[PDB]
Each structure stands twice: as C-alpha cells, then as structure tokens.
Amino acid sequence: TSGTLSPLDIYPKILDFHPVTMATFTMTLARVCLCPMIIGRGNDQVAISSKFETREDIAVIRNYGNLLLEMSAVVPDGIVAFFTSYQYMESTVASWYEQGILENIQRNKLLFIETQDGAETSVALEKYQEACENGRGAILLSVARGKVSEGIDFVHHYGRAVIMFGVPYVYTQSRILKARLEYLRDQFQIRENDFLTFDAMRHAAQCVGRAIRGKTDYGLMVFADKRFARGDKRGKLPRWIQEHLTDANLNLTVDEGVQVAKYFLRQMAQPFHREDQLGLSLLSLEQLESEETLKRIEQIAQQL
Amino acid sequence: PQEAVPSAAGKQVDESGTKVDEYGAKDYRLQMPLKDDHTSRPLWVAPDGHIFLEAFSPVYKYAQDFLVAIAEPVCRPTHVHEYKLTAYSLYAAVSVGLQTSDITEYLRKLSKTGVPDGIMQFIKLCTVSYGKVKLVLKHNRYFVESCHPDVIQHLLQDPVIRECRLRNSELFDFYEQMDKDEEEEEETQTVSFEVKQEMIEELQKRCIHLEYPLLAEYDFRNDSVNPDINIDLKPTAVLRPYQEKSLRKMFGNGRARSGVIVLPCGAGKSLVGVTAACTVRKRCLVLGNSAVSVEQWKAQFKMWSTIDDSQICR
Amino acid sequence: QENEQRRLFIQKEEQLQQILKRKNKQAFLDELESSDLPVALLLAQHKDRSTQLEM
Numbered sequence: 001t002s003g004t005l006s007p008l009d010i011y012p013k014i015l016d017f018h019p020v021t022m023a024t025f026t027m028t029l030a031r032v033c034l035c036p037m038i039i040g041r042g043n044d045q046v047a048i049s050s051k052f053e054t055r056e057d058i059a060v061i062r063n064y065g066n067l068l069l070e071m072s073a074v075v076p077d078g079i080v081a082f083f084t085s086y087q088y089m090e091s092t093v094a095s096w097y098e099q100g101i102l103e104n105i106q107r108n109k110l111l112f113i114e115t116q117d118g119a120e121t122s123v124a125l126e127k128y129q130e131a132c133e134n135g136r137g138a139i140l141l142s143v144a145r146g147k148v149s150e151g152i153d154f155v156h157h158y159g160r161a162v163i164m165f166g167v168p169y170v171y172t173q174s175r176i177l178k179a180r181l182e183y184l185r186d187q188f189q190i191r192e193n194d195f196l197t198f199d200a201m202r203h204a205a206q207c208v209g210r211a212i213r214g215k216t217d218y219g220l221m222v223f224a225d226k227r228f229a230r231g232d233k234r235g236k237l238p239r240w241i242q243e244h245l246t247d248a249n250l251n252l253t254v255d256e257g258v259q260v261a262k263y264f265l266r267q268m269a270q271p272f273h274r275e276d277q278l279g280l281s282l283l284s285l286e287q288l289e290s291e292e293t294l295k296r297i298e299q300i301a302q303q304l
Numbered sequence: 305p306q307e308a309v310p311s312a313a314g315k316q317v318d319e320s321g322t323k324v325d326e327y328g329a330k331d332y333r334l335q336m337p338l339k340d341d342h343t344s345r346p347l348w349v350a351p352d353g354h355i356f357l358e359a360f361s362p363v364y365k366y367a368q369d370f371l372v373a374i375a376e377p378v379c380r381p382t383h384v385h386e387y388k389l390t391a392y393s394l395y396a397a398v399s400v401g402l403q404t405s406d407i408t409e410y411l412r413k414l415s416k417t418g419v420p421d422g423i424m425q426f427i428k429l430c431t432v433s434y435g436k437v438k439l440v441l442k443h444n445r446y447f448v449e450s451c452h453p454d455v456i457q458h459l460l461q462d463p464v465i466r467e468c469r470l471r472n473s474e475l476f477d478f479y480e481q482m483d484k485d486e487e488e489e490e491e492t493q494t495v496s497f498e499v500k501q502e503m504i505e506e507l508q509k510r511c512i513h514l515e516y517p518l519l520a521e522y523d524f525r526n527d528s529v530n531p532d533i534n535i536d537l538k539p540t541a542v543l544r545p546y547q548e549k550s551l552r553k554m555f556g557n558g559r560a561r562s563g564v565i566v567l568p569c570g571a572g573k574s575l576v577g578v579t580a581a582c583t584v585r586k587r588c589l590v591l592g593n594s595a596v597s598v599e600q601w602k603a604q605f606k607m608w609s610t611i612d613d614s615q616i617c618r
Numbered sequence: 619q620e621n622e623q624r625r626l627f628i629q630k631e632e633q634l635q636q637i638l639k640r641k642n643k644q645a646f647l648d649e650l651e652s653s654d655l656p657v658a659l660l661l662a663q664h665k666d667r668s669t670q671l672e673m
Contacts, residue, residue, distance in 0.1 A: 005525075043543050043548050044537065044543060044548075044551065044579060044582075044583060045551050045552060045555035045556075045583060046583070047525070047558070050479065051483050053480060053481055058536055059536055062536065062537070062539070087417075099539050100539065101539065186624075192479050193479060193482045193485070196479075227483070228490060230486060231489065232486070232489070251528075253548070253552070255545065255548065420622075453650055453658075453659070453660065454657050455658050456650060457650045457651075457657040457660075460650055460651035460652075461651075461652075466651055466652070469647075469651065471644060473637065473641070473643070473644060474640065475636070475637075476636055491632035495647070495650070495661070507640050562669055
C-alpha cells in the first residue's frame with residue numbers, strides 16, 4: 001500500500017507475482033508539499049554526479065560542499081543528507097573538514113554524523129531532533145542505505161529538506177549482486193542496468209518517501225546527481241512524485257536550486273490553515289454526501 | 305577565409321547617400337513605414353542597425369532581454385535604451401539557437417515601425433548560414449554536427465567536404481559504467497560524422513567559404529588522450545552570478561564552447577579564466593602582451609588554483 | 619557449458635546489434651552525403667531500418 005515503490009511493473013517480475021491491481025495514486029493538493037529537483041549541474045558547470053565508479057573526484061565533492069553550505073543557510077529547521085555509501089560519506093566529510101567547508105556548515109547548522117554504533121545513531125537523532133526544535137538548527141547526514149533511512153520519519157520540522165548525494169549505487173559486493181543480477185537475467189530476463197537503476201531509485205524514494213507524512217508537512221528534495229536527469233531514471237521514480245519533478249527543475253545549477261528553494265519556502269511558509277484546506281485536498285462529510293466526491297476522486301488513481 | 309568577412313567587413317546593408325534632412329537628421333519616416341500600437345510596441349528598428357527601447361514600456365523586461373540577446377548595447381539611460389545590430393551580435397544570437405523567423409517575428413511584433421527590408425536582409429545574411437553547424441571535438445574525434453540534417457545534407461554535397469569525412473564508428477559501455485551506453489539516449493536532433501584529422505584546417509576554409517561556419521566545441525571531459533593535471537579551484541574561488549552565467553554560456557552544453565567573452569575592467573576576469581582552465585583540466589596556454597600579465601596570471605592561479613610553480617611556467 | 623554459451627550468446631548479440639546499427643547509421647550518413655533522398659524523411663527511414671532490426 002505505500003507510495004514508495006516504482007516502477008510497479010518490475011515487482012511482479014521480481015517477486016514472480018501477478019496482482020489483481022497495479023495502481024498508483026496522485027498526490028492531490030491545493031498547495032503542493034513537494035518540489036523534487038535535480039541539481040546535477042554545479043555553479044562551476046561541473047557535472048555533479050558519482051558516475052565515476054565512486055572514484056576520488058574532488059571536483060564533485062567540492063561542489064557537494066558548496067551546495068550543502070549554501071543550502072544550509074537556505075533551508076529552515078533541520079536538513080537530512082543521504083550519501084550513496086558510508087565510505088564515500090566518510091571520504092567526503094574528511095575533505096570538507098580539511099577544506100574548512102564543514103566549519104561554515106557548522107555555523108549554519110549543527111552537524112550530526114551517523115555511525116554503525118547504536119549509541120551514535122541514538123545520540124545523533126536525539127540531539128538532531130531537539131536541535132531542530134531548540135533555537136539552533138541541525139543537519140543530519142547519513143547513508144541512503146542505512147537503517148536511519150528506515151526507522152526515522154522526517155515529519156514536519158524534522159528534515160524539512162532531503163538531499164540525495166549521487167545515485168545510491170552499491171558497487172561494492174558486486175559478486176553477490178552479480179549473482180542475483182545474473183539469476184534475474186536467467187529466470188526473469190531482467191537487465192542488470194535496468195535493475196541497478198530501479199534498486200537505487202527505490203532507495204532515493206525511501207528517503208523522499210519518509211520526508212512527508214501529512215498535509216501540514218512538506219519537504220524540499222535535491223537529487224544531486226546528473227544521472228537522475230535521464231528520462232529512464234526520472235521515469236522510474238514514483239509517478240506521484242514525478243508530477244512535481246517538472247523538466248524546468250532538471251539539472252539545475254546550485255544557485256537555481258537555492259533560488260527555487262527560497263521561492264518554494266516563501267510560497268509555502270505562508271499561513272494556510274485547516275479552514276483553507278477545505279477548498280481542495282480535504283473533503284468533509286458534506287462533500288462526501290455530495291456525489292461530486294465520487295466523480296472527482298476517480299482521476300486521482302494511477303496505474304502502471 | 306575564417307573571419308566570415310562578408311557581413312563583418314562588407315556590411316552590405318550600410319546605407320549610402322542617406323536622405324539627410326536640412327536639420328541633419330536621417331529622414332527614416334519614409335524608410336521606416338508607420339505601424340500601429342505606438343503605446344504597446346516598445347521598439348524602433350532604424351535601417352542603419354540602430355534600435356531604441358523604452359525603459360518604461362510594460363514589456364521592457366522582455367524587450368531588454370530580447371535586445372540584449374540580439375543587439376549590442378549602445379546607451380542605457382533612465383528612460384530610453386539604444387542598441388545596434390551587428391554580424392557578431394547576430395551570430396551570437398544564432399549560436400544560441402535562435403531562428404531567423406522567431407527573431408524577425410518578435411522584432412516585427414515589438415517594433416513600432418515595419419522592419420526595413422535592408423535590416424531584414426541583414427538578418428537573413430547573418431542568420432541563415434552563420435552557425436547552423438557545429439564542429440564537435442570529443443575523444444580527439446572531429447565530429448561535425450547540426451541540429452537539422454538539412455544543413456549538413458547541403459554541406460555534405462560538397463565534393464571537397466566529402467573527401468574530409470571519415471568512415472568510422474565510436475562504442476557503448478559495460479555494467480561498470482554503462483552511462484556511455486545510456487549516452488545513446490537523445491540521438492534525436494543529433495547527426496554527426498568524423499572528419500580526417502588533417503582536413504579540418506582546409507575544411508574550415510571550405511565550410512566558411514561555403515557559408516557554413518563551424519561552431520567548434522571541445523569535449524574536454526571525455527577526451528581520454530590528453531592527460532589531465534588534476535587542476536582544481538581553491539576554496540577561495542567563489543563565482544559571481546555574471547561569472548557563473550558566463551561559464552554557463554560557455555559550458556552549458558557540457559563541452560567548452562569556443563568563443564569570445566567580454567568582461568569590463570574590474571571584473572573577476574582572471575577568476576573566470578582560471579575557472580575555465582580548472583574546468584578543462586588540460587594543459588592551457590595563456591597569452592598576454594607583457595611578462596606582467598604572465599606573472600599576474602601566475603599569482604592569480606596560485607590564489608585560486610592548485611597549480612604549482614612546477615606546473616605554471618613563464 | 620550453458621554458462622559459457624550464455625555469456626557468448628549475449629555478448630555476440632550486443633556487439634553485433636550495436637555496431638550494425640552504427641553500420642546502418644554510416645550508410646544513412648552516406649545517403650545524406652550522396653543520395654537525393656528526402657532529408658526530412660531519410661532520418662525516419664534510418665529509424666525504420668534500425669527499429670525493424672532492434673524489434
């Protein structure tokens with residue numbers, strides 16, 4: 001039942017399953033809550049990405065540091081940063097600290113770095129959640145694969161912005177992955193590149209999917225990787241999210257994202273109360289007794 | 305023949321024997337036919353290439369961008385602006401992908417007077433052939449490309465040009481990095497072929513002579529053969545929006561779009577150049593008129609780039 | 619033996635279909651260079667030939 005999986009066409013193949021219904025539902029809102037964008041282009045025109053087999057490329061790390069630094073000043077309350085791998089995260093943070101970028105980020109928001117220690121995880125989330133509520137502001141950074149993307153929901157003020165650095169590809173453990181990929185080519189005839197895209201996309205959709213849980217909730221979401229601009233990858237994201245991922249916000253510059261964010265924040269930081277929600281996106285008993293509700297909602301469903 | 309001499313030096317449309325009135329003003333009331341919407345149309349298109357804009361017009365925002373993208377600025381006082389059409393200003397507009405029809409349509413729509421046939425002729429002369437074809441250089445492969453096959457088909461009919469084309473193809477990629485295989489996406493609006501390494505120098509003359517100047521673009525990123533020096537910008541380097549756009553205009557497509565950049569004295573001109581060099585990450589040659597610029601660049605590279613004294617040489 | 623056959627069978631198809639398309643593309647470029655075919659349609663004809671092979 002949740003909206004995190006896409007494309008739905010791959011799960012009957014993968015699970016060798018045949019559902020009665022393969023439907024999706026469009027987020028119906030009078031005032032959008034989500035602005036997915038692909039800031040794949042650095043200000044220096046560097047193609048911000050991890051296409052280089054996760055190789056040590058300072059230029060993208062440098063661009064990642066610039067983006068995060070400025071975005072830390074733009075996003076209110078807390079930020080949640082997801083890296084493609086723990087190694088790359090550690091490698092990246094060390095560079096930003098060495099380059100001093102990390103200190104400018106601290107000035108903007110309290111950094112909380114995740115680690116396999118449940119003590120670190122619990123303390124980081126403890127301090128982060130309350131730091132996002134006290135006078136200060138905090139910025140959680142973790143890995144798109146770890147449990148942090150599983151157990152913590154970034155509801156309301158928690159993680160008002162989710163940032164996906166690079167496409168979350170696990171090129172480590174390739175042997176086991178190859179074996180499963182090969183078996184999928186064999187019994188299911190599923191292309192490895194196709195599956196790899198899907199597998200990373202579903203992880204990106206997890207971070208994004210946990211970024212919002214209500215109507216009085218919203219989340220900025222930056223996909224800091226050129227890869228995401230491919231029609232295939234964008235096309236494999238959840239259709240209800242793709243609705244907001246308008247072409248105009250593809251491969252944006254860092255400045256464009258910052259400006260769009262300031263705009264998006266300005267447009268939704270404005271008062272919009274329970275009574276204002278009765279115009280659209282919320283139907284009362286009176287509207288339910290009105291057959292309009294029966295005919296209007298038909299178009300909300302989607303199928304794949 | 306590489307300077308595209310005719311529209312630049314010949315300037316076919318420059319008037320002679322102009323009907324200068326007793327007051328000394330160019331009497332273009334007859335040459336520029338009267339047209340309606342004097343209050344809604346913000347432009348005047350003088351037959352000598354000069355254009356005037358109203359800073360108070362309601363569409364001034366768009367009209368300014370329109371003239372800024374098509375004509376050279378002359379003066380921008382508080383209420384009126386002046387712009388002048390030139391082959392280089394027009395070619396810059398063509399290279400951005402603007403069509404002669406769109407340019408003519410929006411001009412005719414925004415002009416208070418009908419566009420003079422001499423200017424419409426200059427527009428044609430500077431938009432039809434001026435930049436419809438591009439000369440890509442990726443993987444050390446000189447690929448000639450155009451958005452429309454129509455342009456290259458005509459060009460390819462030239463026997464000398466045909467002798468330049470090389471029969472070569474491209475490969476894809478493996479699962480390690482199959483984005484180069486996924487670079488087969490968007491082959492729509494894309495047609496290109498390789499040209500023999502040594503024919504370029506002669507082919508350039510032939511294409512420009514044939515009225516089809518090549519927009520050369522170097523794919524520094526995928527060029528594997530020229531080794532990278534791991535050049536990178538120091539954190540001290542922060543690009544200003546005009547610098548960022550200037551680099552965006554250059555690297556917008558992804559390749560280094562060769563061309564001329566104009567930055568007024570006092571700008572972070574060196575920061576733009578150092579960033580371009582740091583972006584290309586290939587050995588760079590820099591030219592100035594004095595050893596002072598040479599050491600001025602070297603010092604500026606030191607402050608904004610990783611390049612060492614073992615690497616910068618005067 | 620099937621593992622060997624699977625790899626070779628897959629690789630032969632990929633290499634052949636990829637290059638053969640670019641071989642048709644070279645012919646398509648030869649046509650643009652010397653044929654008198656409709657340039658607006660010549661691209662569609664090339665896409666036809668290739669899609670008929672890909673399908």
